[PDB]
């Protein structure tokens, strides 16, 4: 019925390397500093826009 | 709509086996008369007999008390026209569409005030059972009610299905026999029923005691007594029926004469005894003396 997979790390590392081009090359959260949810929630609640963010 | 327990129809229409196979389909069809949607039951009456189906509204069937699938009465099995006319019944069955819907509705409300034992309305208060209708009943089961149809294929020769044909591989009745045109409405209302009309010509061919001329001839001639008939026994036979004016049992004739003091007594007695008088198992014949 195909739920619940279990892999080893050689598998997971090869999978990672193949998927390398569809993925994001950052390791932390400091990139999304003023671009995360709570930043966009606050921006929306105050009706002000972030340079690259939604209105 | 109706949602019920089981169908009421002639045991002939039920079939031969003591165990029945009946499948229930809720709101399966609309009455051929009432058009009220009612739960239909299907039964296999016998091996190689056509499967029977409940064929009329439960209310429409409780009204007129017939085989809710065979269309024949539940008591003797007589068609509506014949049974009613022999019971001396002139019923006002609805034929209008709007009055028919309203009538079947009100009759379902009346059957709702009824308790499931006696046929609702006037259909019961004529319960003087008529010997003409009794003798018109088929006393043995007519399981021909379930004989299959004709297969047009074998009727032209074409039924290559083998015995698996769902129709009887018999020469078709050339339609002209009026026994072929009994629409559900005709057979239900009992109007223009030519099978029952042939039954009526039969009932006109059925022998009763025709009355003689002389209004003083109250002499009823009894034939077929034997030597085991007693004078007092025949007196007890014709006793409550009125005044027996004289008894004359001719042993050398195996006959007798009952003279009556009431012309009504003599007539009604002879008519009640015609071909039905059974004393000591003897087939006694009533006649009017000369």
């Amino acid at each position: 019925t195909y739920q619940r997979w279990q892999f080893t790390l050689p598998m997971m590392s090869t999978l990672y390397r193949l998927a390398n081009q569809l993925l994001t090359d950052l390791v932390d959260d400091n990139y999304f500093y003023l671009f995360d949810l709570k930043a966009f929630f606050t921006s929306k609640a105050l009706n002000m826009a972030i340079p690259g963010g939604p209105k | 709509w109706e949602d019920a327990d089981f169908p009421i129809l002639c045991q002939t229409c039920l079939g031969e086996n003591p165990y029945i196979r009946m499948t229930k389909e809720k709101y399966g069809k609309e009455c051929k008369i009432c058009a009220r949607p009612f739960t239909v039951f299907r039964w296999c009456p016998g091996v190689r007999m056509r499967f029977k189906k409940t064929e009329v509204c439960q209310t429409c069937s409780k009204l007129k008390n017939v085989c809710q699938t065979c269309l024949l009465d539940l008591e003797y099995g007589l068609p509506i026209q014949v049974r009613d006319a022999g019971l001396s019944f002139k019923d006002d069955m609805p034929k209008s569409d709007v009055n028919k819907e309203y009538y079947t509705q009100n009759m379902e409300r009346e059957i709702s005030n009824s308790d499931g034992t006696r046929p609702v309305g006037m259909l019961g208060k004529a319960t003087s059972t008529s010997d003409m209708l009794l003798k018109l009943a088929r006393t043995t089961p007519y399981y021909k009610r379930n004989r299959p149809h004709i297969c047009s294929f074998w009727v032209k020769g074409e039924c290559k299905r083998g015995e698996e044909c769902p129709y009887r591989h018999e020469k078709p009745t050339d339609p002209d026999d009026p026994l072929a045109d009994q629409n559900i409405k005709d057979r239900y209302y009992g109007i223009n029923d030519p099978v029952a009309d042939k039954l009526l010509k039969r009932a006109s061919t059925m022998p009763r005691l025709d009355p003689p001329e002389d209004k003083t001839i109250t002499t009823l001639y009894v034939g077929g007594l034997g030597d085991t008939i007693t004078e007092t026994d025949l007196r007890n036979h014709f006793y409550q029926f009125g005044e027996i004016r004289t008894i004359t049992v001719v042993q050398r004739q195996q006959c007798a004469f009952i003279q009556f003091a009431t012309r009504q007594a003599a007539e009604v007695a002879a008519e009640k005894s015609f071909n039905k008088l059974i004393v000591n198992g003897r087939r006694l014949n009533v006649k009017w003396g000369r």
């Binding site: - | 196979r21 499948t23 190689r48 083998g162 015995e163 698996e164």
Partner: protein, 143 residues
Amino acid sequence: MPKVKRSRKAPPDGWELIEPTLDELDQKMREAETEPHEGKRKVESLWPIFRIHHQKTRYIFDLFYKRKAISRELYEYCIKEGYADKNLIAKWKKQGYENLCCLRCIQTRDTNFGTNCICRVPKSKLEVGRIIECTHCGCRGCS
């Protein structure tokens, strides 16, 4: 051309001798499949398919169990490639069911009362022999 095969790997080495009968049966099933719906009937137009299906599967049941002339790996491969029928075989394993007409004729839900169809009843129980072609298969007394 063949039953174009999804497994992409080599069929095992006993496959080429079961080949010809299998194929001819397959082209046969295609012909019985194409036989078109004339005054034939509707309920009777699926009977040839259950014939040829029973036949395919009875063949591979022979060439495994009755003769012991096929490897079990080739066997499971011929299961997977649609030449065989898993559940037909799995019933045929049982006792009373040697000649099962098809898998449906024992499916009780397909009837009103939850019983097998008369196809299953032995001929001795009737003792009258009115010929019966089961609606589902068209079979005449499988068992």
